[PDB]
Symmetry: C12
């Protein structure tokens, strides 16, 4: 199953960030994802993003049209996670 990861993506001054590109980098083999595979997603102009993420361990990469990739960190989804925003997984007590 795919857990829904949804939210809005704002910069540090309360405005949406445009030209974004969010990438999920698999680091270990899962039941349905092969290692070293990237899954991309492009937010809209208002900053809304929504993805269907398969469980496993991933590295998050954020690219904004003139930014070298910003390694936000590693997220992990098990068979107990509930739908939420991307930021909670980064801030979650791993």
């Amino acid at each position: 199953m795919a857990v829904k990861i949804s939210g809005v993506l704002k910069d540090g001054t309360g405005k949406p960030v445009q030209n974004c590109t969010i990438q999920l980098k698999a680091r270990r083999n899962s039941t349905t994802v092969v290692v070293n595979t990237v899954g991309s997603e492009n937010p809209d102009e208002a900053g809304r993003y929504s993805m269907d993420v398969e469980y496993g361990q991933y590295s998050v990469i954020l690219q904004v049209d003139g930014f070298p990739p910003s390694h936000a960190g590693t997220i992990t989804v098990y068979e107990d996670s509930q739908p939420g925003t991307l930021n909670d997984f980064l801030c979650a007590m791993t």
Copy 2:
């Protein structure tokens, strides 16, 4: 929420600075801001600035047209912070 930061910024000789821009770079990802994201604002011709800032720790950069980028310092916006000028956050005890 967001704390409102408003004021006017000048130089030693009591004049507004022109063609400048303030950039806040988030050095630690938060519940609403992802790490390593810059949010910028250009003051008006009178040097007046006004912007809504999300909580967390930020690094402040001033860029003036021609001059090398200046690293003013680091600010921290907590849940108990009250509105004020940008200078007080720089001068706040750490």
Copy 3:
């Protein structure tokens, strides 16, 4: 005898991978295959793959148009193996 390897190939965000290529390298020569021989097959537009592999040890290579070759890992198919996705074969205990 050739075990049937069937499945669908997706990434972290639950989408098929296009322009992909799956290669199997015979690591150790067997009574049916000769060592250092590559066998590859391109999945369809929906990311569905089905191959008939001979038994032995193989190293799996994932090739994507644009990215450098990925080293998924190593599979070892015995005479007693049952049909299934290659994801189970990489994640099988060794």
Copy 4:
């Protein structure tokens, strides 16, 4: 408030110095001036200069089309100083 620094600028032969530029490089964060902000002031043909200086610590630089920028020294304006000339601030007992 701004202390009013006024005077005349003469060289060693008792003559006005032209094509000058007095700049104030702020070295510490103040309640009204951000770090590394320069404010220029060009005196008239008779060597008269007058500036309104916000209190704090400054490094005075005197740039003439000729000798490289001459570091006159560091000046400091508390909230007790009275209006005067820049030479007294340079020569004041720190």
Copy 5:
């Protein structure tokens, strides 16, 4: 006498491999073969191969216009062997 070697050459995915070339590099002087002599014989489009090997010691080279020559291993033909496939000679207990 010439031992007949016959078989079908397949890659890891149970398919014939085309454009190949099997070379037998003789490493030791035999009664009828001089050292460092090669014999090339290309199999058909269905992967069928057959040679008339003279007894002795040989190194097998599999050249497939691609990966460099693949030293599959030394074969040895005694004067008590029976006709078979090349893979058995590779896998034979030396």
Copy 6:
């Protein structure tokens, strides 16, 4: 108040020097002269010079059209000084 420094400046053989230039460089800033400020006049065709020198310590440079700059020495005009030739100030006891 500027001491008057007047006289005639000749060479070893008793002739006036033409195309000359006398430069005073303030090595230490005073209440009326800022540090590292140069003052120069060209003497007349007869080698006669007249100066209104502010109090303080200066370094004297002799510049002739063609020769490299000469370093005559250092003078120090106190408050008890009296008008006289420049040549005495270098030769005064220190």
Copy 7:
């Protein structure tokens, strides 16, 4: 006299070798052959060769069009030697 050396020249797979050349370099001067002298003669398409060789020690070279020269070994034709193929002398006990 001359010992007769007649036979056919096959390769590992039982085929004749074309564009071949046998070279006999005399490594020790004899009653009838001076040192460091070669004699080269071309076998036919069937691979047959016929050589009347004088006594002494020789080094045998196979030169086949395209390949680097091959050093088959060294032969020693004595007075008690009987006619035979070239392979027997190389394979003879030394």
Copy 8:
């Protein structure tokens, strides 16, 4: 006052030297001559020279558009001397 120095400049064969030039390099600050000042006096075709030197210490340089400047020696015009020739000052017991 100026000490008159006159004479005739003859080379080693009792002949006048032409195209000559005598320079007096002041080496110590005097009451009437600034340090590092040169005064030339070109003799006539018959080798006669006559100068009006001031008191002090001088280095005599002899430039003859040829051999490089010849540092003859240092002359001191003590304020008890009487007019003479240049050679007497060189030969004088300093």
Copy 9:
């Protein structure tokens, strides 16, 4: 007197060797030959050679258009030698 050295020059295959040239490099002064002198002899198409050698010590160099000069060795002719072939002098027990 000159001893007659005659014979037929054959290679290891038992054939005449054409395009040859035999040279005798004298290494010590003799009664009739000065040291470091070479005398060439070109055999005919059937390999026959015949020279009239003066007694002494020589080094024989057999040069053919091809392989580099092959120094067969040293020959010595004393006042006891009988006419023969070149090969005997090489093989003679010196």
Copy 10:
């Protein structure tokens, strides 16, 4: 006073020296000749030379058109010296 230096200039084979030039260089400055001053004369076509030299130490140089400058030696002509050839002065006891 001046000593008369006269004579004829000859070489080993009793011949006049043509295109010659005699140079006297004042080694030590005296009451009549300044130091490092050269006085030269050219002998006539028969090699006859005559000059009037002042007292002191001189280094004598012979310059011939084509040959490198020769350093004949050093002469020391005194107050009591008698007229003669420069050969005697060069050969005089020192």
Copy 11:
């Protein structure tokens, strides 16, 4: 008195040497020959040479058109020597 040296110089194969030249170099000056003087003679078409040499010690050089100059050796013609070939002088006991 010049001893006459006459003879014919051959090579190993009993032939005259053409385009030759014999050089005698005097290595020690004598009462009739100055040191380092080279006297040469070209033998005729039949190899016959006839020279007459002065007494002393000489180095004998052979020069042949095509080969680098040979160093034949050393001879010493005394006052008691008898006319003979050049070869005997080389072989004479020393």
Copy 12:
């Protein structure tokens, strides 16, 4: 007085040597010759030379447009020598 040196100049093979040039390089100052003065003398086509040498010490150079100048040696002529050939002076007991 000049000693008369006369003779004939022959090489090692009893023939005159042409194109020669005898040079006398003086080494010490004499009463009539200055150091490092050379006097040439070209002999005629018959090798005859006759020179007049002033007494002293000389080094003899023999330039023959060939071998570089040859140091024949030192010749000393006192006021007792009698006329003779150049070779005797070289061979004379020094």
